[PDB]
Amino acid sequence: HNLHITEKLEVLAKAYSVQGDKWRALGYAKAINALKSFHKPVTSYQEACSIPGIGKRMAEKIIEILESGHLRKLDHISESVPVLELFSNIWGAGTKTAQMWYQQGFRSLEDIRSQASLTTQQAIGLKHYSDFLERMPREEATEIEQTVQKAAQAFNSGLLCVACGSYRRGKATCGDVDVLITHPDGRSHRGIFSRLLDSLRQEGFLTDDLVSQEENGQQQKYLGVCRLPGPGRRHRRLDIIVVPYSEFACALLYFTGSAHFNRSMRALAKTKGMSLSEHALSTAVVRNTHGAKVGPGRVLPTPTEKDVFRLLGLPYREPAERDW
DNA sequence: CGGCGGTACTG
DNA sequence: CAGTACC
DNA sequence: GCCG
Ligand SMILES: [Mg+2]
Ligand code: NA
Ligand code: NA
Numbered sequence: 001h002n003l004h005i006t007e008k009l010e011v012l013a014k015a016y017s018v019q020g021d022k023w024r025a026l027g028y029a030k031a032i033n034a035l036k037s038f039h040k041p042v043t044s045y046q047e048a049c050s051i052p053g054i055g056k057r058m059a060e061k062i063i064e065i066l067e068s069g070h071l072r073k074l075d076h077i078s079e080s081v082p083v084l085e086l087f088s089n090i091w092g093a094g095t096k097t098a099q100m101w102y103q104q105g106f107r108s109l110e111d112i113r114s115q116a117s118l119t120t121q122q123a124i125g126l127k128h129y130s131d132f133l134e135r136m137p138r139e140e141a142t143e144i145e146q147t148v149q150k151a152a153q154a155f156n157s158g159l160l161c162v163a164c165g166s167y168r169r170g171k172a173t174c175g176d177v178d179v180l181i182t183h184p185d186g187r188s189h190r191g192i193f194s195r196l197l198d199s200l201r202q203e204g205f206l207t208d209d210l211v212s213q214e215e216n217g218q219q220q221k222y223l224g225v226c227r228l229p230g231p232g233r234r235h236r237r238l239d240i241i242v243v244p245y246s247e248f249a250c251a252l253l254y255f256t257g258s259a260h261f262n263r264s265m266r267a268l269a270k271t272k273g274m275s276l277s278e279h280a281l282s283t284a285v286v287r288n289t290h291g292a293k294v295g296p297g298r299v300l301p302t303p304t305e306k307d308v309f310r311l312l313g314l315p316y317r318e319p320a321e322r323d324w
Numbered sequence: 325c326g327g328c329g330g331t332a333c334t335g
Numbered sequence: 336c337a338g339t340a341c342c
Numbered sequence: 343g344c345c346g
Contacts, residue, residue, distance in 0.1 A: 213332090239340095278342080
């Protein structure tokens with residue numbers, strides 16, 4: 001339903017997030033995702049508490065709003081939150097850096113540009129501040145995947161390239177492009193990055209690099225910036241991971257998401273004494289009282305996403321049924 | 325009381 | 336290592 | 343923040 005109330009909680013959720021109160025912000029995270037997944041809206045301090053994810057304190061405020069239209073917290077929110085959100089929206093900069101800059105008296109991107117000490121990643125983020133905030137129509141996401149897949153098969157017709165993330169989940173727009181590159185023969189994917197990177201660099205397709213350790217042939221991922229030729233083109237974020245065919249499934253699942261999906265999913269295997277990762281699904285995982293993995297385990301074979309759902313006692317769910 | 329996902333670069 | 340990032 |  002999307003109640004004007006939850007629309008007032010997200011205002012807080014983001015507040016505690018940017019302020020670095022991850023856990024509390026996480027609490028407001030699921031309580032909102034619940035009120036957003038409600039068939040028809042409620043108006044009782046009880047019926048609400050009933051709803052899974054919504055705790056005592058949560059409903060205590062719901063009343064106030066619905067009931068009133070007022071929310072005490074919203075008015076006592078530090079006049080720092082917006083500036084922290086501004087700063088935190090710079091790629092490479094998080095809550096920690098944001099609070100540091102604010103503490104140093106920084107209040108705008110102007111101030112950041114002239115006086116702030118930036119990392120190479122943040123300098124790039126600031127450079128495309130607006131670009132990194134827009135989404136692209138999926139049609140263009142396709143053109144970018146196609147562009148990488150072309151440069152990939154360009155030297156190995158066996159290379160399998162796919163576009164994951166929100167794309168594979170069937171969204172109209174995309175925040176970036178997440179390309180997965182593997183190889184059925186389980187070996188031909190070895191030490192290829194620089195080949196492709198240098199290829200896409202030839203096409204002038206890549207504009208900037210954020211994360212790319214290529215001096216080490218074991219590089220797993222590439223996060224960078226690209227831009228199609230022609231006018232009206234904007235810079236877009238491009239992520240690329242190359243995994244061996246053996247972990248393809250788990251990689252595909254991971255890269256498809258959503259983020260809340262993998263967390264919730266991995267939390268499930270966690271209970272069943274199992275462990276899931278972009279690499280593989282393990283069973284008989286040894287952990288201590290603090291949930292820390294003390295002993296690895298057996299990597300169950302999983303050549304298809306279905307196998308993962310299956311092994312986790314879960315019914316398969318299409319990429320579109322993962323958008324949560 | 326205390327976990328809340330599992331992992332890959334950067335400097 | 337802490338920070339930040341990918342989903 | 344919630345929840346075991
Ligand atoms: Mg994406
Ligand atoms: Na950021
Ligand atoms: Na991405």
